[PDB]
Design a protein around this ligand. Structure first.
Ligand code: SRM
Ligand code: SF4
Ligand code: CL
Ligand code: CL
Ligand code: K
Length: 538
């Protein structure tokens, strides 16, 4: 690989980072949007104030403003649902480690409540909140309200660093390796410039997913992140081995590979910065399907990429990976739903099932109430789109289990519900080929009526090949498609995936059977469960 390939392609200009003039040939349309106007100006120069005053029908009449609402606003965590909920915006937070407060939860509930049938909220597969129904004129006030309660929505979509995932049991599990909260907090603060915006990392060639591991269970899914910090002692010092480049896409799914690098715990932010700078400076910016960081790693080779990270470290120092990490390969992933003792004597946490991650305003208020009455006002989100309420005096558990809302958000739902994950789908998402959330609940309910089982089978439903619900990690995955019934009529269907494994012995699942009409999935799944997962007909 020639030395010319290593010339940084972006430069700092007036506080923002822009593609150099000589590197603008052949770029994709999204890169052109970013050049035409810097998205971060909508927040950092308060461009949103005047934009929000323009009626949406007028906004749609010019490319600049249409691109503002459809593309640039994703830098402020705002996602126009143009096709399926025109004029309304989904809003996505930064929520490092999935940690929320009751006050924050009530604030979010109050926002969605205003929008009635157009409002609701969802827990995401990055243990994050999304709210729905937002209208553009309300955006300035919502941004202010979020800041007031200690939340940010910065840099949560498009070509940005996504929600930093950690251990949902951080600080409370007797069996944790290291509390991930300080690290995911530091990452989020770095990424967002302490909630002011950080232009140095907001002009990436593509999205980029980070996680910090603190569990033997690998709840954080390090194998499918762009950067995963694996806890490891090296020469008597605590730090992290680094895995890089994991990603899913329609075209290609790849597990993260070792960078062959270890950093002391205090170098978490420095190395995140170095890797992001290398990606920003050097990544391809053509075909959007070839812009994720792994494509750069393949182009330079992992050693070539490593050298680019190393030169961007303070004092240009980057140690080689530790021979061993702290994650024990002898491990059985633990159920976190239900009541579990914390490492703090006399305290428990409770994991509650949130059916397909969907809540209404009234539900959010009730969960916030529980957190205040029983816990410490904390609600934690999980990547299976469930919740944990920590820090509950164990003597209160008996009373808690009698709370009416636990009949809906149960500490012990049927086993297939415990493992069920589903993306937004076509209720709101314009890319979706099928409806996911309602369908997945219906099918799972019917399947569990027919068979009992003891193996914790994990079923993931995703609405299109973007695979936001990670079907490649599932025991049984369902990817939306259109197919045909016996009469040749168009019907919703799924491509069925098998082979996904998580934890230390991870593996990416692959298509097993294409184009199954959704109305025909129940018998197929019942038989798969009996034949491959020890299920017994009722
Ligand atoms: C909400 C969420 C699914 C969920 O129900 O939980 C989601 C929802 C969407 N994803 Fe995703 N993705 C979600 C996690 C993921 C993940 C899973 C993960 O991070 O572990 C992936 C696969 C892993 C990965 O990225 O490597 C994922 C891969 C995509 C892709 C394909 C990326 C690619 O390289 O091709 C797109 C499309 C794109 O970016 O070009 C996408 C695009 C989208 C958009 C923004 C598409 C669009 O604007 O409508 C979806 C918004 C729908 C809506 O209204 O909610 N989403 N998306 C997740 C939000 C996570 C968060 O809080 O930040
Ligand atoms: S997998 Fe497809 S349908 Fe589901 S949220 Fe992602 S982009 Fe939308
Ligand atoms: Cl996006
Ligand atoms: Cl859309
Ligand atoms: K769930």
């Amino acid at each position: 690989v020639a030395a010319e390939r290593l010339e940084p392609r972006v430069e700092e200009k007036d506080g923002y980072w822009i593609l150099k003039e000589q590197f603008r040939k052949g770029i994709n349309p999204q890169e052109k949007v970013k050049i035409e106007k810097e998205p971060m100006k909508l927040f950092m120069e308060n461009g949103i104030e005047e934009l929000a005053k323009i009626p949406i029908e007028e906004i749609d009449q010019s490319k600049l403003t249409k691109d503002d609402i459809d593309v640039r606003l994703k830098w402020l965590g705002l996602f126009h649902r143009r096709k399926n909920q025109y004029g309304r915006f989904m809003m996505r937070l930064k929520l490092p480690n999935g940690v929320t407060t009751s006050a924050q939860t009530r604030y979010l509930a109050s926002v969605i409540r205003k929008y009635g049938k157009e409002g609701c909220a969802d827990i995401t597969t990055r243990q994050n909140w999304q709210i729905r129904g937002v209208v553009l004129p309300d955006v300035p006030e919502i941004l202010k309200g979020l800041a007031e309660v200690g939340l940010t929505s910065l840099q949560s979509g498009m070509d940005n660093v996504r929600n930093p995932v950690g251990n949902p049991l951080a600080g409370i599990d007797p069996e944790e390796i290291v509390d991930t909260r300080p690290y995911t907090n530091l990452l989020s603060q770095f990424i967002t410039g302490n909630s002011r915006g950080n232009p140095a990392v907001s002009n990436l060639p593509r999205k980029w997913n980070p996680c910090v591991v603190g569990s033997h269970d690998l709840y954080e899914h390090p194998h499918i992140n762009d950067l995963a910090y694996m806890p490891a002692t090296k020469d008597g010092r605590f730090g992290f081995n680094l895995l890089v480049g994991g990603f899913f896409s329609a075209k290609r799914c790849d597990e993260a590979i070792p960078l062959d690098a270890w950093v002391p715990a205090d170098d978490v932010v420095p190395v995140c910065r170095a890797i992001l700078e290398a990606f920003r400076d050097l990544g391809f910016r053509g075909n959007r399907q070839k812009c994720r960081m792994m494509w750069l790693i393949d182009e330079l080779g992992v050693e070539g990429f490593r050298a680019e990270v190393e030169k961007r470290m303070p004092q240009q120092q980057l140690e080689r990976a530790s021979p061993e990490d702290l994650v024990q390969k002898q491990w059985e992933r633990r159920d976190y739903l239900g009541v579990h003792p914390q490492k703090q004597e006399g305290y428990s946490f409770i994991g509650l099932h949130i059916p397909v991650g969907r809540v209404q305003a009234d539900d959010m208020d009730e969960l916030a109430r529980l957190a205040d009455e029983y816990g410490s006002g904390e609600i934690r989100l999980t990547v299976e789109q469930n919740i944990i309420i920590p820090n509950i005096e164990t003597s209160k558990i008996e009373a808690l289990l009698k709370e009416p809302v636990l009949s809906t958000f149960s500490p012990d739902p049927p086993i297939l519900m415990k493992g069920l994950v589903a993306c937004t789908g076509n209720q709101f998402c314009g890319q979706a080929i099928i409806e996911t959330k309602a369908r997945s609940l219906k099918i799972t309910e019917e399947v569990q009526r027919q068979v009992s089982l003891t193996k914790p089978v994990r079923m993931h439903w995703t609405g299109c090949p973007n695979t936001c619900a990670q079907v490649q990690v599932a025991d049984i995955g369902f990817m939306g498609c259109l197919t045909r019934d016996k009469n040749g009529k168009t019907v919703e269907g799924a491509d069925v995936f098998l082979g996904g494994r998580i934890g230390s012995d991870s593996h990416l699942g692959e298509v097993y059977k294409k184009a199954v009409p959704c109305d025909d999935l129940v018998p197929l799944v019942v038989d798969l469960l009996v034949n491959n997962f020890g299920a017994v007909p009722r």
